[PDB]
Amino acid sequence: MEVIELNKCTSGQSFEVILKPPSDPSLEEIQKKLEAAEERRKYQEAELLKHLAE
Amino acid sequence: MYTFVVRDENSSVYAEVSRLLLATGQWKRLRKDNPRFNLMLGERNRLPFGRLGHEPGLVQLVNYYRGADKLCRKASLVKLIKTSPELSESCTWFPESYVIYPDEREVFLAAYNRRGNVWIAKSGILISSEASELLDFIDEQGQVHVIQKYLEKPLLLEPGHRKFDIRSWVLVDHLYNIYLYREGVLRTSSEPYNSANFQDKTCHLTNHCIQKESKNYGRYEEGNEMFFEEFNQYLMDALNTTLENSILLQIKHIIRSCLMCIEPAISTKHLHYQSFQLFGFDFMVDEELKVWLIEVNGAPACAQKLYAELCQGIVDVAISSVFPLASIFIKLHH
Amino acid sequence: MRECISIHVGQAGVQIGNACWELYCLEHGIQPDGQMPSDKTIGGGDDSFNTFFSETGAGKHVPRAVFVDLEPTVIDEVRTGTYRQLFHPEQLITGKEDAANNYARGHYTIGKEIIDLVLDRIRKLADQCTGLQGFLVFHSFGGGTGSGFTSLLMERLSVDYGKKSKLEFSIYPAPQVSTAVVEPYNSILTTHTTLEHSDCAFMVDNEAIYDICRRNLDIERPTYTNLNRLISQIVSSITASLRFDGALNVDLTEFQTNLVPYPRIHFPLATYAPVISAEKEQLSVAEITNACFEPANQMVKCDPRHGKYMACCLLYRGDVVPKDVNAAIATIKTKRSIQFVDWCPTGFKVGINYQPPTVVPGGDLAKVQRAVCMLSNTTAIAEAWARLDHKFDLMYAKRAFVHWYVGEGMEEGEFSEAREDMAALEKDYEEVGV
Amino acid sequence: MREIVHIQAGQCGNQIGAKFWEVISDEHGIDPTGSYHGDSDLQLERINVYYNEATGNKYVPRAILVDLEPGTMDSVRSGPFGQIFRPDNFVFGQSGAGNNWAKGHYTEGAELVDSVLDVVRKESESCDCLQGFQLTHSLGGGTGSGMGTLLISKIREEYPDRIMNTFSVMPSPKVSDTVVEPYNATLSVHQLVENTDETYCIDNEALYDICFRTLKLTTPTYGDLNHLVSATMSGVTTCLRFPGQLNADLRKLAVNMVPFPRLHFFMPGFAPLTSRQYRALTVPELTQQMFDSKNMMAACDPRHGRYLTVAAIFRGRMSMKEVDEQMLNVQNKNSSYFVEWIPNNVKTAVCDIPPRGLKMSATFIGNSTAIQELFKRISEQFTAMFRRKAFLHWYTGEGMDEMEFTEAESNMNDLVSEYQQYQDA
Ligand SMILES: Nc1nc2c(ncn2[C@@H]2O[C@H](COP(=O)(O)OP(=O)(O)OP(=O)(O)O)[C@@H](O)[C@H]2O)c(=O)[nH]1
Ligand SMILES: Nc1ncnc2c1ncn2[C@@H]1O[C@H](COP(=O)(O)OP(=O)(O)CP(=O)(O)O)[C@@H](O)[C@H]1O
Ligand SMILES: Nc1nc2c(ncn2[C@@H]2O[C@H](COP(=O)(O)OP(=O)(O)O)[C@@H](O)[C@H]2O)c(=O)[nH]1
Ligand SMILES: [Ca+2]
Ligand SMILES: [Mg+2]
Ligand SMILES: [Mg+2]
Ligand SMILES: [Mg+2]
């Protein structure tokens, strides 16, 4: 094994041991998806109210 | 009431185990995909170990050890024996073997040039005396292959000058107890051993399928199968020794060595599900009464006379141990 | 000093956030009224604990935290709890009616109406930061708010804070405490949408916590309080490096650097020990380090013996010196199956904090002299994904409950799109560890 | 504040509705004057779900009483808890509905429905955050069946995003008033398929059999039947009325129980059902009985179908470890009766406050494909008359056409086959 990067301070210490070496969508796009889902809800409600109106 | 599922329709052993479970009246079989089981008789390949032990309120047990394939694949068995300190490159009961990808081909040529120089290649088996014809045959295939020294001096049964191998059935329960079934079987060749004719693969191969397709199948014993009582009597009459002293002590030692070596890798002692598994060990005996390990089978079939006893023993020690209801095994202590 | 903002979303995130900030105050000696006698720089400072606490001129130490939930009952217990004086009303955001265990309702329907308010309140906290390094987000997979609104928030945070790191603490659904049948749907939907916006995510399976509470704490039927006090101890062990002096994992970027070499495979496995009943012998460095390789102590039940490691961090609290860690590691490596991938060093990064773990007075956890949390990025955690994706497949083949999601304006194609991403994620784990 | 608006319509709907408010008022410590007199804050913690707060901390049921004749309502007003109800919430006519769906739905009920929607609106307007509505009614009469489903349709038009829940009493020739009950029920069921999120199917056949066989009541009255219903209604609403984690509101319950929108008809059950009682019940006994067919209120054999979803509610002081234990016991013993393509489809809740006169009880709510037997029964009785157009003149006299009956029959047979589809899947 090999210990490396041993740092010590008052509240503790840290180090590394090696056992072996090796061998986004924009604001516009998000708003678009939110409004498209909103419009699909509005369309489904309008179809219901149309059904109830019949 | 205990519940189990069946997922390998081709298993001879566990088709009988499920029968005995239903015969107790205290076990109930479910559909293949029902996750609410106590016992799974799983498929051979890609058993979903990751989905076991996650059903609230159910103790779940499967008939396979995850990771046991390393012992039951010929290539990985050779690598395991070489690279494991517990077994080591020194290992005396395992034939000198080398893994050849179509890799340790240069270390094989070195030990071969030092040198009887007959080897055998297997994954479709070639037995040759020159290394060039072996390596050419491996590269003609696409699967990873292994070659090992062919046992040029096997113990030959008389009369017949006959080769044979010993199959031992070993059950390892969820506590990693190692149980050796007291009844083994000898798969015997029917033709006299021919040290100058390795092209004829009938007197050199003792498999049941190969001997049932040699014109002496069933001559000396039924189905080329000799059981332990007769073999022990032969050893006493012919060689003034016993099966236990001359062979079985070495068999029990090899079974213990192999299974203890992988125990930390496959044990389910503190796992969220439990495992047991039935293993088929294949041994070879030379003329000096030294036992060699040939192969470990992870999904073995049983001897047709021994199905009833061995499967009941599976229910007794592997299943009812975890699920109690309302010895044919030799416990190999370790 | 660089500040960290914590965001708690939905019931699980909020109740776990409560447990964590109660624990942080005990660890840093902050009283429930917000006063901290050991802090001599009254009204400001750039100490390590200031990463998580701002300060008022009156010497009150205020969490850099925002709580958001779409119904008010859980956050009202924060407004009236032991640490009510800690938080000011702007940090506690409540809606009227929840997402009904429906990802689409949390993400699209209700999330669209509240996202701008949430971001406004986060902006107010960010404006108090001299150098904000990013966000820690606490939420469930299974809840409609924890799944649906979190993923919307994570998208917008990537937009409004492009350079900031985002870490997650995610509660993976377990049927013996779960409240909905559709939690596998919500889990896959939120993982698909969040995957590209999270730099490192610590999954906690309620099944693992539940069984640890039963087995080690002798609690017959654990409650959320029992679960959350254990979870808070693990969370605290993970975030201690941000809150105390040290050299390991001192900023959020180092979590990714030390644990996530491949960006999509950003789900480290956490293992914690010892967990000791307060109603009950002090374990050694070797014993608690050996316990880090027992599945019974993991935050997600899986078998690391049948995967490969990409990284391993050991975080010790209490009486621990490097010599005993190295002696413990040498012993364990000779006796256990620890296989790293070939393109990674077989090594451990060790952090020691001399202060032993704080326990909540009157809680279920005994005070111990040394504890450890191991963070290991192992392919074995893909077992959790395979379990979840399988339950998804069983319901989705019959389209069971899908109408609830479509009825909120989600397209059925988002289901299969999310499921295909998860199938690719399972392929990535297979490509790396087998 | 997650308020629910309660509506009870017609003779059956008002008689079971009055008993329901009688029972839960006692559980919440509310006396017949609307003042609280209990000894636990669990009683008041979610009391706004069903009650408004009046002056002097008086609690008034958020309940609307509807009928097309004054008789039953007069009786309710004279009843034990009669003065508890808001007097403005009594909405009634004089003509009656003559056990005629068309009179309830199209003629007599049409003249009264706007007055009811005015009272619904006034209650809904003072809701901090209305969850939705619960309706109690029979399907075999005229007002509860015909006007009740008219109300559901108009309530949906006005509150499209709110949950609609009903307790619907299904007619049986064993406990019948008129021969036309299968007509009224078939017409109503199609309304419920389209306009309700959750319907508790209460079969008068099952209630009678339980009273006679199990309770040892030789001559059961409607009062005896309503004892089982109000006890069941208290059990199924326990998750809404007390602090809880599971199925705590109407929308969460529907999301957990309804995998396909039309299959929202539940078989309720209750335990214990015992003859007149001091003997302590154990958790194994509660669990076995609540899943027993003889404890279910829909006269359908669960063993003839498969459970899509199940919600179980245990009440009283008992071991949650034992509750979890026995509940997992039942699933893992008869896992063939639960569909496998909905994993973990049985959800359990526990409430500490037991019902009156019991230390422990269990309420069962099942979405089982066996409910098709109930709709098959009604369809057979409908067809036996409709093939000869018998008694149709009562309905064509109110303006209905034979084609509306044919459509209703076709609609309910479609519902039956939809259940059979998922029973074999
Ligand atoms: N460990 C833990 N898990 C919790 C807690 N609260 C809820 N859960 C789990 O979270 C999942 C349910 O999601 P919740 O967080 O309750 O729901 P939510 O985020 O508020 O979303 P909605 O209520 O649907 O709007 C289930 O798997 C619960 O077991 C908690 O306090 N601690
Ligand atoms: N090194 C060696 N020396 C001598 N004989 C050998 C040998 N390797 C293999 N054999 C013979 O070849 C036969 C088959 O060998 P192997 O066990 O590799 O094949 P196999 O896996 O098909 C048998 P099974 O499937 O029944 O376990 C054995 O019966 C044995 O007699
Ligand atoms: N369980 C129960 N069923 C009732 C009661 N009263 C009537 N019924 C049933 O309801 C149907 C008659 O409907 P009813 O409510 O009297 O007609 P309405 O006043 O026009 O709504 C028949 O199936 C009766 O068996 C009651 O008090 N309890
Ligand atoms: Ca300061
Ligand atoms: Mg083989
Ligand atoms: Mg919630
Ligand atoms: Mg009547």
Author numbering:
A (entry chain E): 6 to 28, 44 to 74
B (entry chain F): 1 to 102, 126 to 138, 144 to 151, 159 to 248, 250 to 362, 373 to 380
C (entry chain A): 1 to 280, 284 to 437
D (entry chain B): 1 to 42, 45 to 278, 282 to 360, 369 to 438
Manuscript excerpt for this entry:
The three taxanes in clinical use, paclitaxel (Taxol), docetaxel (Taxotere), and cabazitaxel (Jevtana), are part of a large family of chemically diverse compounds that bind to the so-called ‘taxane site’ of the αβ-tubulin heterodimer (Field et al., 2013; Steinmetz and Prota, 2018), the building block of microtubules. Because taxane-site ligands stabilize microtubules and suppress their dynamics, they are collectively called microtubule-stabilizing agents. In the case of taxanes, one hypothesis is that they preferentially bind to a specific conformation of tubulin. It is well established that tubulin displays two prominent conformations that are related to its assembly state: a ‘straight’ conformation present in assembled microtubules (denoted ‘straight tubulin’ hereafter) and a ‘curved’ conformation observed in unassembled tubulin (denoted ‘curved tubulin’ hereafter). With the aim of providing insight into the mechanism of action of this important class of anticancer drugs and into the tubulin-taxane interaction, we solved the high-resolution structures of three different taxanes bound to curved tubulin by X-ray crystallography.
Here, we solved the crystal structure of baccatin III the core moiety of paclitaxel-tubulin complex at 1.9 Å resolution. We thus decided to approach the issue from a different angle and started off with baccatin III, a precursor in the biosynthesis of paclitaxel that contains both the C2-benzoyloxy ring C and the C10 acetate ester, but lacks the C13 side chain with both the 3’-N-benzamido phenyl ring A and the 3’-phenyl ring B moieties. Notably, baccatin III is largely biologically inactive despite displaying micromolar affinity for microtubules. We found that baccatin III shows detectable affinity (Kb 25°C 3.0±0.5 × 103 M–1) to unassembled tubulin, which is in the same range as for other compounds that have been co-crystallized with tubulin, such as epothilone A 8±3 × 103 M–1 and discodermolide 2.0±0.7 × 104 M–1. We found that the ligand binds to the taxane site of curved tubulin with its C2-benzoyloxy ring C stacked between the side chains of βH229 and βL275 in the leucine-rich β-tubulin pocket lined by the side chains of βC213, βL217, βL219, βD226, βH229, βL230, and βL275. Its carbonyl oxygen forms a weak hydrogen bond to the main chain amide of βR278. The C10 acetate is exposed to the solvent and, together with the C12 methyl, is within van der Waals distance to βG370 of the βS9-βS10 loop. Furthermore, the oxetane oxygen and the C13 hydroxyl accept hydrogen bonds from the main chain amide nitrogen of βT276 and the βH229 imidazole NE2, respectively. The C4 acetate is buried in the hydrophobic pocket made up by βL230, βA233, βF272, βP274, βL275, βM302, βL371, and the aliphatic portion of the βR369 side chain.
